[PDB]
Symmetry: none
Subunit: 224 residues, 3 copies
Amino acid sequence: MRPVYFLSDFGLEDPYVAVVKAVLAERAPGPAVVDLAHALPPQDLRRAAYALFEALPYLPEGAVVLAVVARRAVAALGRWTYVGPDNGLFTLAWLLDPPRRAFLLEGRDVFAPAAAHLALGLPPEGLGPEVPVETLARLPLALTEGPEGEVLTFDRFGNAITTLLRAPVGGFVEVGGRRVPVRRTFEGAPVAYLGSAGLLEVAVNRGSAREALGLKEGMPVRLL
Amino acid sequence: MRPVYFLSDFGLEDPYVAVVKAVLAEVVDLAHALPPQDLRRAAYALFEALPYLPEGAVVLAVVDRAVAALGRWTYVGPDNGLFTLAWLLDPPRRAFLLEPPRPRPKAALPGWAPGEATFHGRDVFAPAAAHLALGLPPEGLGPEVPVETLARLPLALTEGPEGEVLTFDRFGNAITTLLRAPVGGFVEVGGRRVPVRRTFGGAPVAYLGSAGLLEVAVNRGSAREALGLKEGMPVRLL
Amino acid sequence: MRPVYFLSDFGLEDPYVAVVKAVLAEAPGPAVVDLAHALPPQDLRRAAYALFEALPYLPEGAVVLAVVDPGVGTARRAVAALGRWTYVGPDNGLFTLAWLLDPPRRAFLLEPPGRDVFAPAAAHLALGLPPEGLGPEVPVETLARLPLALTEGPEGEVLTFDRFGNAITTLLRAPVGGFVEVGGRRVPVRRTFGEVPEGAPVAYLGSAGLLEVAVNRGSAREALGLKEGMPVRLL
């Protein structure tokens, strides 16, 4: 058996989360279901894709990453197993774990059954037709070592998360027309550092970089 | 035991939901980030999930007389009509006034005591739900009262053609009381004529929703905002 | 095995919250209950109170994991404290009010293998493993405390606010029929906030045993321009 990590964008405002749990319990009672049903932000694919990118490494290999959110539904197999919409949500996750195989799942009710099936270890070919992994939809996002990148999204504190994979110590980064020093240790001035997800982040000591620097999603970020 | 499904308007900023869960453990969440005091929104949420829940489950819902009503499913919450729609799917046979023993705080400063009647979810509903979840008799909760005395909101689902806006979802979609959405037809609400459709592909559209009620949405938008809709607004099938 | 109650100001949508839950679920594992994650960013007083509100009702021995760390990227200890309940979080005074109810018997410095030390520590304690394995033991008196004190009065202060704007004070008493002064104005103390006209100021003993100030059907915080730290006094 393999555990099911249930991710969704309910924000504790949609009772459907309980229906999904009921379906998983009825079709595959054995497998554990880790409730992360409110971990994804709704109507913000870039931020949702980033959230998965940061969390994925902490999930046990082989776990069924279930994302309940017109777009076809798919299952993808890599180090981890994925079940969700083929709308680019898993774009960043797949950079860490390029899927080896993918399958078409033949509304919102399509996901749980597929996840249960895979959780029980039943053959994927049973979910539906196999499709080439190259046909899996991807957001036009790229994580680079620089020097040019962009503001991917922001966190609740206003810190800006970028697409840059390197934060040269003693170096400087340009964003919002401001030149920010790259350090580690953090005064309402900005600072850049390699964040928890391995991506360069920009923060304002005790403040909001987003608001203080008037930053916007999609803005350019340049390592100097 | 019987599982406990929990719904409230407690929000995500306070530890109220957790405290109720703690008392219960002395639990599956339905929803907690619902608009405060919004009974219609809460009534619909229960309606939406009830049919998929295990028979005999205890539905604890706190959104504002404290009662417990028994049907195929068990209900615990305020007698303010919150359970109106759920009861259309499962009309209670018996109801009881809740007078369970108040939970005892484990830590307490000298002569310290919490305010009286300041957190019913914790001191009245939670102990009642635990009692029922354990399988203990309902009469052990308090005096029995006639189900006919239970409160209900003035919500009527209907084939139409006249209905009303029941509530809105988190995206601003309007949920109506209409049970049918004629193919190729039109629905009038807020002075606008909205086309009814099955497949989609800033524009408003009507369709039969996941709970069997006609809904009005705006592609990548808020029907509530964009169309200036409000609860109670009449909806008419043209 | 003990349950884990998790509090923070990151917001439910922050992946850090998912990571912690994944680390804690890394069968059998502890039940994980969220206290709250949408607390106002960096608001230690509000968080401290939330812990105070919930503590008396949590299972004895529960692990309280609270991560409100405004001291991000600064010198501050990460610690675990053991009492009737167990605490894991930054040594920034966040647990001040909880410790008034439950004075820690032991404290440990969480050594790194940095908030990435919190989840692992919580899991270690939830499983009932030796606290010695977390890092070096330290004196409990050295634990940081916020400059807060719950008092009998008559002088107190506005501690924090709830979502509706009700002001939570540090006063442990709310004598009905009496009066409390806040901002120079006399506010009546009643059994409940409804015993006054809509829009009128009123004081009462809250759900956590502290005197609260509200505006019936309104927001005391906004309507009265209240601020944390503001002097309050029983008349």
